[PDB]
Amino acid sequence: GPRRPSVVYLHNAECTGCSESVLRAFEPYIDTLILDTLSLDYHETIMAAAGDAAEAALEQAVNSPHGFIAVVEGGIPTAANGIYGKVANHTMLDICSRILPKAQAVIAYGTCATFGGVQAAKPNPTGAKGVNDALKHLGVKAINIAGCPPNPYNLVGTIVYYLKNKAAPELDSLNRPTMFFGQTVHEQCPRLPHFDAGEFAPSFESEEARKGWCLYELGCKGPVTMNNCPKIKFNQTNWPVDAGHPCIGCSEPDFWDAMTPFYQN
Amino acid sequence: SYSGPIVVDPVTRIEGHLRIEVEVENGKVKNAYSSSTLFRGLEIILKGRDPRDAQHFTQRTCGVCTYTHALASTRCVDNAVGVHIPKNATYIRNLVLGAQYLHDHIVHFYHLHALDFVDVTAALKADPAKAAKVASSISPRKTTAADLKAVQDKLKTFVESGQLGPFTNAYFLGGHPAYYLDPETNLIATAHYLEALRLQVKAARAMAVFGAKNPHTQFTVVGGVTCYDALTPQRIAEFEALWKETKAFVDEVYIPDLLVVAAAYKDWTQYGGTDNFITFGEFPKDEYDLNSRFFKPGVVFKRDFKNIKPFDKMQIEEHVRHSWYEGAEARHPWKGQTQPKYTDLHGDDRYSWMKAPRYMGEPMETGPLAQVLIAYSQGHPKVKAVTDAVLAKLGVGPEALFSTLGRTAARGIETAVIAEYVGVMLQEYKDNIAKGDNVICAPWEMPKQAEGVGFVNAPRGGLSHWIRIEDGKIGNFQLVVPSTWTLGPRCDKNKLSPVEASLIGTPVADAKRPVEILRTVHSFDPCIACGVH
Ligand code: SF4
Ligand code: SF4
Ligand code: F3S
Ligand SMILES: [Mg+2]
């Protein structure tokens, strides 16, 4: 078979939910992605090597003359010279500073990597930043695939696009691909006719909630959130509003502070 | 034999950022340190916020044990406000949790643990027809020579490409003295590793049927759940079908592989033991009574299972003397504090971002071995039947459970038991709907001042979230997480934590490829984002 493109997958300040989302890949599934589509050359969650052997695997991939794609999960802690997060006794700041400028393409995957995420919420004790913010002085320009976690459809679609075209797709003003992030959740929502008719559930226990009325008065952030949730859904089967719960705005920068209280508008 | 230090950083095939340091003499570990090397500070971030928001933040403690912290925070705030949630909310929450256990443990055994035991490259030397006969002898599911050949051919193409990917620099490349399986057994396990990559998609989907999405569910609220669609026959049938397929994989693939591996590695009954166990119970009928749970809470000291002690939540204190926090005060979590102060590795005798929880001053293992052993000792009939069948098949006595092998076995036992119990909960839920109960959420009111606690027994053990509500806002919110118990550092009495203690005596055949350390560490299923938050 032809040589497969190298992927280096980094974990910074993260919960591993973004890694888990990639495992949910569907048509293609994750086995197809790592056996046929790509060469997954470093990934702390699943790789066989540990310790020094793992570090060596990372070095081998990064210095390949074929180049590599970096997929980055998690925010970069920058307070106190980066000491709140270390791997192999190097700060995550230092690791990303050395590796990411060498990548042929960088994908920041998840709201943490894109915008700083949960650890960057006030008062941000670790000085966590998204990739582009943290490494702007080094000219790193990551494609941002937001969400907490994102839809893995959006990661695989971006990778496939890059492999085909050797370029990023059209990006929005937050560096997110417009093919996935071009519409608000709300404008795609099945409950939109209720919003538009002023038909709001007043509580989760109400008959209006039972009948599927709009969740705006219960805090829904769909109107101010860009994502493809109602269209693609998750796990081939559901998404928050169809489970009766408001959108919390999880693909938006600083949503933890901008969209709270979550049960209010 | 090797004498000197071994450092494993990163420990891969866990959640989060762990550094293990050991001292080895004459080929055996004589000391160990568990160093967690990422801090986020979710407890600091929560201060002053709306208690209703807590579950959304705390769920992001961990996406491997997704849902569990949303459930713990919701139980915590439910408890603080004094709401008695409807029966269906308890059923739906319990069903989603049961599904989480199945997903988590399947992925752990195959995708995190098995590469410590399975030489995937040796599978290329196997006769697939012989491998299929072996597989068919250990499971009611018949495995064909042709299906194992398909796996082998795919692997051959992958290895021959020279791009080994996740197998680059594996400890098993070229063979390793501590890797014992024959080629046929390696092929069976490798085939099932690949099968599990697809099966886990279905196991996770089961959570999204009621819970919106996986990872990070979105269906819980203070007072109950939001998912009216979960009452429908269509959604229930969808969940049921996914559950049935998942259970079949547990019973017919995971458990037989676990037993074959355990039988080949019976020497691993001799390493990785611990003394004390704590568990919180799970799957309640009554949200205000831990002893209404399918598994019950309990505390055991010094392997004394004849004298199980009641769990007293006031006997938990989290130490910081060997952690990167200010001072040396051990605090109960309703008086918890999270005051970072980094000193570098071993600076001021500190080496981790985890606190060190102690129960009556003692280090406690939690997780599947604790839940299984304590439930067995309480007379739990399902746990006893499965545990006894496993011991009989392996030809070992109960003492074998106090080990790395035993812990790994207990994870499977719990998976099998919970897989069955999910069907019982599902039937009770259906029966409740059939009687006319279509309520899923109860009204409640925020007190200006209150304390609450929520308890979950998660896939890695006893999880507790603790809130102090002041002026209707979060005055304090503290998480004490299973991996904090198990993988936290020493306390101010210098007592080794369970993982540290378990590592003493581990043999190491090749210090450059220290798979023995990984076998024991991985048997605890570490989750460092959980442990530190
Ligand atoms: S974006 Fe969300 S799911 Fe992904 S690492 Fe961050 S907290 Fe976890
Ligand atoms: S439920 Fe949310 S996304 Fe849907 S119509 Fe209402 S406000 Fe918009
Ligand atoms: S919470 Fe996130 S997953 Fe979609 S529905 Fe809202 S952007
Ligand atoms: Mg804590």
Side-chain angles (χ1 to χ4, degrees), chain B residues 374-397:
Chain B
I374 289 170
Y376 190 113
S377 301
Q378 292 162 333
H380 194 295
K382 302 300 197 171
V383 174
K384 176 174 164 62
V386 175
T387 300
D388 286 348
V390 165
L391 293 173
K393 177 71 185 198
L394 293 178
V396 297

Side-chain angles (χ1 to χ4, degrees), chain A residues 15, chain B residues 40 42 54-76 97 100 216-217 220 454 456 458-460 462-465 477-484 527 529-533:
Chain A
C15 79
Chain B
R40 290 175 295 152
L42 305 184
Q55 59 154 329
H56 299 294
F57 286 79
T58 66
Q59 195 174 192
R60 280 62 176 180
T61 295
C62 187
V64 173
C65 64
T66 191
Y67 175 56
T68 70
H69 289 278
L71 180 60
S73 281
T74 303
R75 284 177 176 174
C76 176
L97 184 57
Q100 171 60 30
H216 292 338
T217 56
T220 38
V456 170
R460 294 159 185 75
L463 171 62
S464 56
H465 285 195
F477 202 104
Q478 293 286 323
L479 302 68
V480 186
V481 187
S483 290
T484 322
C527 194
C530 265
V532 180
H533 41 280

